[PDB]
Amino acid sequence: TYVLYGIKACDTMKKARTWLDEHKVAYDFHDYKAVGIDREHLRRWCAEHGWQTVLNRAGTTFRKLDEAQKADLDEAKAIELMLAQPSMIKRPVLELGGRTLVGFKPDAYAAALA
């Protein structure tokens, strides 16, 4: 089972789902606004990709954090931030079985699924 993680109202999600849907890929959608997220997922994604890849530091939600919250980040600290505020997780995450894709690069989707 492929699993796509994110939210509905996101242009990157819309783009990625259009790619998947048009390529007739079956996937489950894990919607943070419907079901949240847990540490087990975040630990796995960060292990594979790095917390700087999984955490959307460029995004508005991170920008708004207080000083202490942004200081001296490492994997453990980044995971706690994302756990409480899933808006900070880069979108999408796509679980392929043995590995995941973070963000939407059509060539990576093609390499994995076409």
PDB file of N, CA, C and O in Angstrom, residues 58-104:
ATOM      1  N   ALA A  58      11.427  26.729   5.770  1.00  0.00           N
ATOM      2  CA  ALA A  58      11.101  27.904   4.945  1.00  0.00           C
ATOM      3  C   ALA A  58       9.672  28.352   5.146  1.00  0.00           C
ATOM      4  O   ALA A  58       9.314  29.470   4.818  1.00  0.00           O
ATOM      5  N   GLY A  59       8.838  27.476   5.664  1.00  0.00           N
ATOM      6  CA  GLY A  59       7.421  27.741   5.705  1.00  0.00           C
ATOM      7  C   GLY A  59       6.987  28.665   6.827  1.00  0.00           C
ATOM      8  O   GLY A  59       7.687  28.918   7.786  1.00  0.00           O
ATOM      9  N   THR A  60       5.757  29.143   6.699  1.00  0.00           N
ATOM     10  CA  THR A  60       5.257  30.153   7.607  1.00  0.00           C
ATOM     11  C   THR A  60       5.174  29.658   9.032  1.00  0.00           C
ATOM     12  O   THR A  60       5.435  30.418   9.967  1.00  0.00           O
ATOM     13  N   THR A  61       4.775  28.407   9.217  1.00  0.00           N
ATOM     14  CA  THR A  61       4.575  27.905  10.567  1.00  0.00           C
ATOM     15  C   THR A  61       5.887  27.911  11.349  1.00  0.00           C
ATOM     16  O   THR A  61       5.948  28.345  12.514  1.00  0.00           O
ATOM     17  N   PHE A  62       6.947  27.441  10.716  1.00  0.00           N
ATOM     18  CA  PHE A  62       8.251  27.518  11.369  1.00  0.00           C
ATOM     19  C   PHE A  62       8.691  28.953  11.592  1.00  0.00           C
ATOM     20  O   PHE A  62       9.211  29.277  12.667  1.00  0.00           O
ATOM     21  N   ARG A  63       8.477  29.816  10.607  1.00  0.00           N
ATOM     22  CA  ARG A  63       8.930  31.212  10.730  1.00  0.00           C
ATOM     23  C   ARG A  63       8.405  31.829  11.999  1.00  0.00           C
ATOM     24  O   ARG A  63       9.086  32.648  12.619  1.00  0.00           O
ATOM     25  N   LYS A  64       7.186  31.451  12.368  1.00  0.00           N
ATOM     26  CA  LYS A  64       6.482  32.060  13.500  1.00  0.00           C
ATOM     27  C   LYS A  64       6.950  31.560  14.871  1.00  0.00           C
ATOM     28  O   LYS A  64       6.562  32.122  15.872  1.00  0.00           O
ATOM     29  N   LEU A  65       7.736  30.497  14.954  1.00  0.00           N
ATOM     30  CA  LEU A  65       8.161  29.982  16.257  1.00  0.00           C
ATOM     31  C   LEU A  65       8.965  31.003  17.046  1.00  0.00           C
ATOM     32  O   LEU A  65       9.536  31.926  16.470  1.00  0.00           O
ATOM     33  N   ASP A  66       8.985  30.828  18.364  1.00  0.00           N
ATOM     34  CA  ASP A  66       9.789  31.664  19.246  1.00  0.00           C
ATOM     35  C   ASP A  66      11.260  31.303  19.145  1.00  0.00           C
ATOM     36  O   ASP A  66      11.628  30.233  18.657  1.00  0.00           O
ATOM     37  N   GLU A  67      12.086  32.180  19.686  1.00  0.00           N
ATOM     38  CA  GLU A  67      13.527  32.047  19.578  1.00  0.00           C
ATOM     39  C   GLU A  67      14.035  30.739  20.159  1.00  0.00           C
ATOM     40  O   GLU A  67      14.849  30.035  19.531  1.00  0.00           O
ATOM     41  N   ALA A  68      13.578  30.419  21.364  1.00  0.00           N
ATOM     42  CA  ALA A  68      14.035  29.229  22.049  1.00  0.00           C
ATOM     43  C   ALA A  68      13.684  27.992  21.249  1.00  0.00           C
ATOM     44  O   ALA A  68      14.408  27.006  21.290  1.00  0.00           O
ATOM     45  N   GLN A  69      12.575  28.039  20.511  1.00  0.00           N
ATOM     46  CA  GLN A  69      12.090  26.871  19.789  1.00  0.00           C
ATOM     47  C   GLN A  69      12.928  26.585  18.548  1.00  0.00           C
ATOM     48  O   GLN A  69      12.978  25.454  18.099  1.00  0.00           O
ATOM     49  N   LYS A  70      13.572  27.615  18.008  1.00  0.00           N
ATOM     50  CA  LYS A  70      14.376  27.461  16.805  1.00  0.00           C
ATOM     51  C   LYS A  70      15.845  27.180  17.115  1.00  0.00           C
ATOM     52  O   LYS A  70      16.608  26.890  16.218  1.00  0.00           O
ATOM     53  N   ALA A  71      16.238  27.286  18.374  1.00  0.00           N
ATOM     54  CA  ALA A  71      17.654  27.209  18.755  1.00  0.00           C
ATOM     55  C   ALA A  71      18.247  25.794  18.758  1.00  0.00           C
ATOM     56  O   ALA A  71      17.611  24.849  19.222  1.00  0.00           O
ATOM     57  N   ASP A  72      19.474  25.676  18.256  1.00  0.00           N
ATOM     58  CA  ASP A  72      20.289  24.467  18.380  1.00  0.00           C
ATOM     59  C   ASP A  72      19.522  23.211  18.001  1.00  0.00           C
ATOM     60  O   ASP A  72      19.532  22.214  18.719  1.00  0.00           O
ATOM     61  N   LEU A  73      18.877  23.239  16.849  1.00  0.00           N
ATOM     62  CA  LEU A  73      18.079  22.108  16.447  1.00  0.00           C
ATOM     63  C   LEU A  73      18.920  20.894  16.071  1.00  0.00           C
ATOM     64  O   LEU A  73      20.040  20.981  15.564  1.00  0.00           O
ATOM     65  N   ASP A  74      18.327  19.743  16.328  1.00  0.00           N
ATOM     66  CA  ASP A  74      18.841  18.444  15.958  1.00  0.00           C
ATOM     67  C   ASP A  74      17.622  17.571  15.682  1.00  0.00           C
ATOM     68  O   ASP A  74      16.478  18.058  15.698  1.00  0.00           O
ATOM     69  N   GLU A  75      17.848  16.302  15.372  1.00  0.00           N
ATOM     70  CA  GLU A  75      16.727  15.448  15.004  1.00  0.00           C
ATOM     71  C   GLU A  75      15.667  15.385  16.113  1.00  0.00           C
ATOM     72  O   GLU A  75      14.464  15.520  15.844  1.00  0.00           O
ATOM     73  N   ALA A  76      16.095  15.164  17.345  1.00  0.00           N
ATOM     74  CA  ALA A  76      15.131  14.986  18.424  1.00  0.00           C
ATOM     75  C   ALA A  76      14.249  16.219  18.580  1.00  0.00           C
ATOM     76  O   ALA A  76      13.016  16.126  18.741  1.00  0.00           O
ATOM     77  N   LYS A  77      14.875  17.385  18.563  1.00  0.00           N
ATOM     78  CA  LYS A  77      14.134  18.614  18.752  1.00  0.00           C
ATOM     79  C   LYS A  77      13.185  18.903  17.584  1.00  0.00           C
ATOM     80  O   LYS A  77      12.052  19.357  17.782  1.00  0.00           O
ATOM     81  N   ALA A  78      13.646  18.651  16.372  1.00  0.00           N
ATOM     82  CA  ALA A  78      12.821  18.857  15.191  1.00  0.00           C
ATOM     83  C   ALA A  78      11.585  17.966  15.230  1.00  0.00           C
ATOM     84  O   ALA A  78      10.483  18.389  14.867  1.00  0.00           O
ATOM     85  N   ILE A  79      11.764  16.724  15.655  1.00  0.00           N
ATOM     86  CA  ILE A  79      10.643  15.809  15.738  1.00  0.00           C
ATOM     87  C   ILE A  79       9.593  16.336  16.720  1.00  0.00           C
ATOM     88  O   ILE A  79       8.390  16.287  16.439  1.00  0.00           O
ATOM     89  N   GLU A  80      10.015  16.857  17.869  1.00  0.00           N
ATOM     90  CA  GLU A  80       9.032  17.394  18.803  1.00  0.00           C
ATOM     91  C   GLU A  80       8.251  18.554  18.214  1.00  0.00           C
ATOM     92  O   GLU A  80       7.053  18.676  18.461  1.00  0.00           O
ATOM     93  N   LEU A  81       8.908  19.414  17.455  1.00  0.00           N
ATOM     94  CA  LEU A  81       8.216  20.545  16.832  1.00  0.00           C
ATOM     95  C   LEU A  81       7.151  20.057  15.846  1.00  0.00           C
ATOM     96  O   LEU A  81       6.017  20.543  15.834  1.00  0.00           O
ATOM     97  N   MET A  82       7.533  19.114  14.996  1.00  0.00           N
ATOM     98  CA  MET A  82       6.607  18.587  13.984  1.00  0.00           C
ATOM     99  C   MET A  82       5.462  17.780  14.568  1.00  0.00           C
ATOM    100  O   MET A  82       4.362  17.772  14.015  1.00  0.00           O
ATOM    101  N   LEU A  83       5.727  17.105  15.679  1.00  0.00           N
ATOM    102  CA  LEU A  83       4.724  16.282  16.328  1.00  0.00           C
ATOM    103  C   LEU A  83       3.572  17.161  16.791  1.00  0.00           C
ATOM    104  O   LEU A  83       2.400  16.808  16.606  1.00  0.00           O
ATOM    105  N   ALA A  84       3.892  18.289  17.424  1.00  0.00           N
ATOM    106  CA  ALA A  84       2.843  19.158  17.934  1.00  0.00           C
ATOM    107  C   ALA A  84       2.174  19.959  16.828  1.00  0.00           C
ATOM    108  O   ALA A  84       0.994  20.302  16.951  1.00  0.00           O
ATOM    109  N   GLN A  85       2.929  20.265  15.773  1.00  0.00           N
ATOM    110  CA  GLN A  85       2.450  21.137  14.685  1.00  0.00           C
ATOM    111  C   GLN A  85       2.776  20.509  13.333  1.00  0.00           C
ATOM    112  O   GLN A  85       3.732  20.914  12.667  1.00  0.00           O
ATOM    113  N   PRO A  86       1.955  19.558  12.887  1.00  0.00           N
ATOM    114  CA  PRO A  86       2.191  18.915  11.595  1.00  0.00           C
ATOM    115  C   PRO A  86       2.230  19.830  10.389  1.00  0.00           C
ATOM    116  O   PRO A  86       2.736  19.407   9.348  1.00  0.00           O
ATOM    117  N   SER A  87       1.711  21.050  10.486  1.00  0.00           N
ATOM    118  CA  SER A  87       1.859  22.030   9.414  1.00  0.00           C
ATOM    119  C   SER A  87       3.301  22.242   9.014  1.00  0.00           C
ATOM    120  O   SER A  87       3.540  22.636   7.861  1.00  0.00           O
ATOM    121  N   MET A  88       4.246  22.028   9.923  1.00  0.00           N
ATOM    122  CA  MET A  88       5.678  22.207   9.687  1.00  0.00           C
ATOM    123  C   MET A  88       6.336  21.081   8.932  1.00  0.00           C
ATOM    124  O   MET A  88       7.516  21.170   8.641  1.00  0.00           O
ATOM    125  N   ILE A  89       5.634  19.978   8.686  1.00  0.00           N
ATOM    126  CA  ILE A  89       6.213  18.863   7.937  1.00  0.00           C
ATOM    127  C   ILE A  89       6.178  19.181   6.442  1.00  0.00           C
ATOM    128  O   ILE A  89       5.149  19.594   5.919  1.00  0.00           O
ATOM    129  N   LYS A  90       7.292  18.988   5.745  1.00  0.00           N
ATOM    130  CA  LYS A  90       7.307  19.167   4.304  1.00  0.00           C
ATOM    131  C   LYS A  90       6.295  18.222   3.652  1.00  0.00           C
ATOM    132  O   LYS A  90       6.124  17.080   4.072  1.00  0.00           O
ATOM    133  N   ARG A  91       5.662  18.719   2.598  1.00  0.00           N
ATOM    134  CA  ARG A  91       4.618  17.974   1.875  1.00  0.00           C
ATOM    135  C   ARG A  91       5.072  17.707   0.435  1.00  0.00           C
ATOM    136  O   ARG A  91       5.725  18.567  -0.188  1.00  0.00           O
ATOM    137  N   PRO A  92       4.496  16.669  -0.161  1.00  0.00           N
ATOM    138  CA  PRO A  92       4.033  15.467   0.528  1.00  0.00           C
ATOM    139  C   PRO A  92       5.142  14.665   1.151  1.00  0.00           C
ATOM    140  O   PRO A  92       6.315  14.942   0.920  1.00  0.00           O
ATOM    141  N   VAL A  93       4.763  13.636   1.905  1.00  0.00           N
ATOM    142  CA  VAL A  93       5.617  12.461   2.086  1.00  0.00           C
ATOM    143  C   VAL A  93       4.890  11.319   1.407  1.00  0.00           C
ATOM    144  O   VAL A  93       3.679  11.153   1.584  1.00  0.00           O
ATOM    145  N   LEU A  94       5.601  10.533   0.605  1.00  0.00           N
ATOM    146  CA  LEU A  94       5.013   9.400  -0.099  1.00  0.00           C
ATOM    147  C   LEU A  94       5.783   8.158   0.298  1.00  0.00           C
ATOM    148  O   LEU A  94       6.990   8.061   0.032  1.00  0.00           O
ATOM    149  N   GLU A  95       5.091   7.215   0.941  1.00  0.00           N
ATOM    150  CA  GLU A  95       5.654   5.931   1.353  1.00  0.00           C
ATOM    151  C   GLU A  95       5.465   4.915   0.247  1.00  0.00           C
ATOM    152  O   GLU A  95       4.355   4.663  -0.193  1.00  0.00           O
ATOM    153  N   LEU A  96       6.579   4.359  -0.199  1.00  0.00           N
ATOM    154  CA  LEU A  96       6.641   3.457  -1.337  1.00  0.00           C
ATOM    155  C   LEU A  96       6.842   1.995  -0.933  1.00  0.00           C
ATOM    156  O   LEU A  96       6.835   1.106  -1.773  1.00  0.00           O
ATOM    157  N   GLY A  97       7.041   1.749   0.350  1.00  0.00           N
ATOM    158  CA  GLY A  97       7.331   0.411   0.823  1.00  0.00           C
ATOM    159  C   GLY A  97       8.660   0.398   1.554  1.00  0.00           C
ATOM    160  O   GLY A  97       8.708   0.517   2.770  1.00  0.00           O
ATOM    161  N   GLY A  98       9.752   0.285   0.822  1.00  0.00           N
ATOM    162  CA  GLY A  98      11.058   0.296   1.455  1.00  0.00           C
ATOM    163  C   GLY A  98      11.626   1.688   1.687  1.00  0.00           C
ATOM    164  O   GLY A  98      12.663   1.833   2.341  1.00  0.00           O
ATOM    165  N   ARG A  99      10.960   2.715   1.165  1.00  0.00           N
ATOM    166  CA  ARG A  99      11.510   4.052   1.216  1.00  0.00           C
ATOM    167  C   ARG A  99      10.441   5.085   0.963  1.00  0.00           C
ATOM    168  O   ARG A  99       9.294   4.742   0.665  1.00  0.00           O
ATOM    169  N   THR A 100      10.826   6.347   1.116  1.00  0.00           N
ATOM    170  CA  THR A 100       9.881   7.440   0.988  1.00  0.00           C
ATOM    171  C   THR A 100      10.436   8.550   0.112  1.00  0.00           C
ATOM    172  O   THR A 100      11.661   8.714  -0.019  1.00  0.00           O
ATOM    173  N   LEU A 101       9.522   9.319  -0.471  1.00  0.00           N
ATOM    174  CA  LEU A 101       9.860  10.555  -1.153  1.00  0.00           C
ATOM    175  C   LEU A 101       9.294  11.724  -0.355  1.00  0.00           C
ATOM    176  O   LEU A 101       8.151  11.688   0.077  1.00  0.00           O
ATOM    177  N   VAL A 102      10.090  12.765  -0.196  1.00  0.00           N
ATOM    178  CA  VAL A 102       9.690  13.984   0.495  1.00  0.00           C
ATOM    179  C   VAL A 102       9.685  15.123  -0.519  1.00  0.00           C
ATOM    180  O   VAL A 102      10.663  15.348  -1.211  1.00  0.00           O
ATOM    181  N   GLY A 103       8.569  15.834  -0.590  1.00  0.00           N
ATOM    182  CA  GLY A 103       8.362  16.829  -1.616  1.00  0.00           C
ATOM    183  C   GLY A 103       7.942  16.174  -2.920  1.00  0.00           C
ATOM    184  O   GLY A 103       7.898  14.950  -3.032  1.00  0.00           O
ATOM    185  N   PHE A 104       7.601  17.000  -3.896  1.00  0.00           N
ATOM    186  CA  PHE A 104       7.129  16.521  -5.183  1.00  0.00           C
ATOM    187  C   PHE A 104       8.072  16.940  -6.290  1.00  0.00           C
ATOM    188  O   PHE A 104       8.071  18.107  -6.697  1.00  0.00           O
TER     189      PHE A 104
END
